[PDB]
């Protein structure tokens, strides 16, 4: 029943966990608790096999642990700044080489998989700070420049015409802008990691920078110069939709250093670089 | 509630939009509609009615009924020209006619025009006239021979006082602009003596002619716009 299917989504009971059955004392030469970790397989022993359990009807569900749920929350991926200090023409526009590597929180989550395929929902939170008092009428333009398209070099560059590129215009006082993007790779999935180069010489680049070119995000204050200077900070949020992930991996254990690389720093006292807390000894809980 | 997405255009006021709106007089019942003769449902009904062309609107005639008449008389030279005007529905000698005024509320026009002429001499006055339409792409004809090579009617005055010349829709494009724009300039209408104005003795040696215009079954206007045949240069007060 596609309606029975719907009731489960509303209650979040699509993926139920198994019940615990009653077990009894045993005496046999079948020893489930014994095994060999050398095989590379996890012992599949359950509680009913080691202790005498009662019958319990499980109600827990795994819905929230699904990949869709784990990566399906908007997180910040960039904070764009347009600060008018002394030259409107030079300070009223900027650009950003798109990527999901600059903010640790969402980067770590996606990097718990080797490959991932998903659509994206971008939400923008612009905030205009009045440095001199008034803010006037702020209108912003965010333009997606795919690799190859002309990048604007002045606030009146012809590229802002956006004859083919996608642009979103936002007016101060209106709701936060938002839009969807389909899976963009030229491959079947995005590479969270890439053990490869863009050539075979000592000067070839290594890593995801080779495969994850997403283009540039160009933005500008559409409004022309005003008497009072403002500082506009636009925060970009990303969320994955219709997600699929492959080959899970160990979580990032040390701070990130740069984008597109697994490089890290290490101090003289390494225990400070990882989340592991020193134990007094083996028996001090 | 129902998630919605406010689209561009929201909140704006377009003078030509077609939305619904709450009524300020709820429960009000309008006066019963009675039958009144003369109802009009489409302006085409008005374009199909003849109105006079102020064809003789020279500066000395404007402000006089004589601006509507063309004088005819015994000629000493053969094939003389009587009158000449542009055929464009909103061009100037005919801009102030009813069809011209209505056409001036639209940007495009198409269809055939019907020009009628009524002779007003005595019953003993005779005359034959050539009414010609010259399609575009050439200057106005400089002689009767040059004019009769185009569309034309030879009118013989008699018991029936009126004749009609139909200016067929002959254009490259399906429509034309109503405002004086060369590209869509429709041509000319000229009138010449086919023979002469003859009268017996003791009869007025001159006579008038009235000119009318209306649209044929294929006449049609398009793209409403404001007119330039009327203006307001100050407040209209109580």
């Amino acid at each position: 029943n596609p309606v029975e299917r719907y009731v489960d989504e509303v209650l979040n009971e699509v993926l139920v966990v198994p019940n615990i059955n009653q077990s009894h004392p045993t005496t046999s030469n079948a020893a489930p608790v014994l095994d060999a970790a050398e095989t590379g397989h996890t012992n599949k022993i359950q509680p009913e096999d080691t202790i005498e359990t009662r019958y319990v009807q499980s109600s827990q569900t795994l819905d929230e642990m699904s990949v869709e749920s784990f990566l399906g929350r908007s997180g910040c991926i960039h904070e764009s700044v347009l600060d008018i200090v002394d030259n409107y023409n030079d300070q009223s526009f900027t650009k950003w080489n798109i990527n999901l590597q600059e903010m640790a929180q969402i980067r770590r989550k996606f990097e718990m998989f080797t490959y991932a395929r998903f659509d994206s929902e971008i939400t923008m939170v612009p905030s205009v700070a009045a440095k001199d008092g008034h803010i006037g009428h702020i209108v912003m333009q965010y333009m997606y420049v795919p690799p190859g398209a002309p990048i604007p070099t002045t606030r009146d560059d012809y590229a802002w015409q956006s004859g083919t590129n996608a642009s979103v215009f936002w007016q101060h006082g209106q709701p936060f802008p938002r839009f969807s993007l389909p899976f963009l790779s030229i491959a079947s999935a995005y590479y969270m990691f890439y053990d490869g180069y863009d050539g075979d010489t000592y000067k070839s680049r290594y890593g995801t920078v080779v495969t994850n070119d997403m283009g540039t995000l160009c933005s500008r204050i559409v409004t022309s110069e005003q008497l009072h200077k403002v500082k506009v900070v636009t925060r970009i949020y990303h969320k994955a939709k219709h997600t699929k992930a492959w080959c899970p991996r160990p979580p990032r254990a040390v701070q990130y250093s740069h984008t597109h690389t697994t490089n890290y720093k290490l101090s003289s006292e390494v225990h400070n670089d990882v989340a592991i807390r020193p134990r007094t000894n083996l028996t001090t809980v | 509630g129902l998630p919605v997405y406010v689209t561009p255009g929201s909140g704006q006021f377009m003078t030509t939009d077609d939305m619904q709106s709450p009524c300020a007089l709820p429960w009000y019942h309008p006066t019963k509609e009675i039958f009144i003769p003369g109802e009009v449902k489409n302006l085409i009904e008005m374009c199909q009615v003849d109105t006079l062309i102020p064809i003789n609107s020279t500066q000395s005639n404007i402000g006089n009924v004589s601006m509507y008449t063309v004088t005819l008389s015994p000629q000493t030279k053969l094939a003389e020209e009587i009158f000449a005007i542009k055929v464009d529905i909103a061009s100037h000698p005919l801009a102030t006619t009813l069809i011209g005024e209505i056409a001036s509320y639209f940007t495009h026009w198409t269809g055939s025009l019907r020009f009628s002429f009524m002779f007003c001499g005595t019953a003993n006055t005779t005359l034959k006239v050539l009414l010609a339409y010259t399609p575009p792409g050439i200057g106005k004809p400089r002689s009767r021979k040059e004019a009769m090579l185009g569309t034309h009617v030879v009118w013989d005055v008699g018991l029936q006082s009126t004749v009609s010349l139909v200016v067929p829709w002959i254009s490259a494009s399906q429509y034309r602009f109503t405002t004086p724009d060369t590209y869509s300039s429709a041509g000319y209408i000229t009138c010449w003596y086919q023979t002469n104005f003859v009268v017996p003795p003791n009869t007025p040696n001159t006579a008038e002619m009235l000119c009318f215009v209306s649209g044929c079954k294929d006449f049609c206007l398009r793209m409403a716009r404001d007119t330039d045949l009327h203006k307001q240069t100050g407040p209209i007060t109580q």
């Binding site: 309606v3 509303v10 | 129902l2």
Partner: peptide
């Protein structure tokens, strides 16, 4: 999705979001 009833006076009882916590006050009795 919503529950439509008929008798004709239809009671379109809509639930605009995908979670139970999202709906309004409960029915009594």
């Amino acid at each position: 999705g919503a529950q439509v009833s008929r008798q004709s006076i239809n009671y379109f009882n809509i639930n605009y979001f995908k979670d139970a916590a999202s709906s309004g006050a409960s029915r009594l009795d």
